[PDB]
Amino acid sequence: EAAQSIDQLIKARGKVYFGVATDQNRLTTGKNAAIIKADFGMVWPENSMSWDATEPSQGNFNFAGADYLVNWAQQNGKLIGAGCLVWHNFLPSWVSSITDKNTLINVMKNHITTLMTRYKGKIRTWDVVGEAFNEDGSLRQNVFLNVIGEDYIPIAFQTARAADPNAKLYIMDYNLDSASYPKTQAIVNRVKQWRAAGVPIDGIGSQMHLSAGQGAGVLQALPLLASAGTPEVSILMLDVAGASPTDYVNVVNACLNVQSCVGITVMGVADPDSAFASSTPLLFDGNFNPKPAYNAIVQDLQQSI
């Protein structure tokens, strides 16, 4: 049927992409590859770029998984996003154990530089720092903050910019979905301050793992995130418990309303492959058919001349 690719449709409304997280296991099973080819314009490695996946012991990198994703994307004319270079998730214990500031700075920089160098020029968007905030808006006391202090964020971004000046560099977080929530306010105010200091934060990515009914609030939260003045904002890791068309269309329209929002990435293709499968939160079902939210996004994005 005509005009059924949400990526094609969102591009026709001036955005860069509709994307999805994936990896080798997905691409070779189900109908994921076919759906991504037809309907999506950007992919991200779901897990294969994590620190656990890529640098399981100090200085010794594992790129088979990430390479597969990058190659598939290139073969299929998809943009690539990748991450997360620096966050508290999927960290090896060898990183967590480090207590010396200069050692951890250099471990972090080596991790950033190695990954970004390998894929230099190939990656549209790097999620450089993730989940750096507490719910109250203070900085999360992860190993980087505890050992390096708050300079770890400027250092990560400056390192990333040097490693691949072509990439758009993002900070990302979750629970940025309500405009009155302290975390949302805080990332904005802090990104403003980092950018005023010349830290090369090109984007804020909102990890939109939503519960039912939360789409509406994104219509206020996304504009708020964009007010930090980054060149770009993005929607990441999108899923919605119950997958209501209302929620999904609200999220999409928040993207459309926000000039600097370049695109939307969903957390996966089909419900059974979600980490939250019982909540059926994705756009395709367990038979790989498009759900009502997919079709509602199509209608919302369709445009006579």
Ligand X SMILES: O=[N+]([O-])c1ccc2nn[nH]c2c1
Binding region for ligand X (CB under 6 A): 21, 44, 46, 83-84, 127, 236-237, 265, 267
CA 286 from centre of chain: 24
Q: Which strand (E) or helix (H) includes residue 83?
A: strand 79-86
Nearer of residues 21 and 105 to ligand X, judged by Cβ: 21
Nearer of residues 21 and 179 to ligand X, judged by Cβ: 21
Question: Measured at CB, which residue is nearest to ligand X?
Answer: 83
Q: C-beta of 228: minimal distance to ligand X in Å?
A: 18
Q: C-beta of 3: minimal distance to ligand X in Å?
A: 25
Nearer of residues 173 and 300 to ligand X, judged by Cβ: 173
Nearer of residues 101 and 211 to ligand X, judged by Cβ: 211
Q: C-beta of 304: minimal distance to ligand X in Å?
A: 34
Q: Are strands 17-22 and 232-240 parallel, antiparallel or unpaired?
A: unpaired
Q: C-beta of 6: minimal distance to ligand X in Å?
A: 15
Sequence-ordered list of residues with C-beta below 8 angstroms from that of 80, at least 6 positions apart, any chain: 42, 43, 44, 69, 70, 73, 74, 119, 122, 123, 124, 125
Residue identified by tokens 């200069």 is: 102
Listed in sequence order, the DSSP H helices in 99-142 are 101-118
Nearer of residues 21 and 148 to ligand X, judged by Cβ: 21
Distances (CA, A) of 64 to 45, 47, 120: 12, 12, 16
Q: C-beta of 236: minimal distance to ligand X in Å?
A: 3
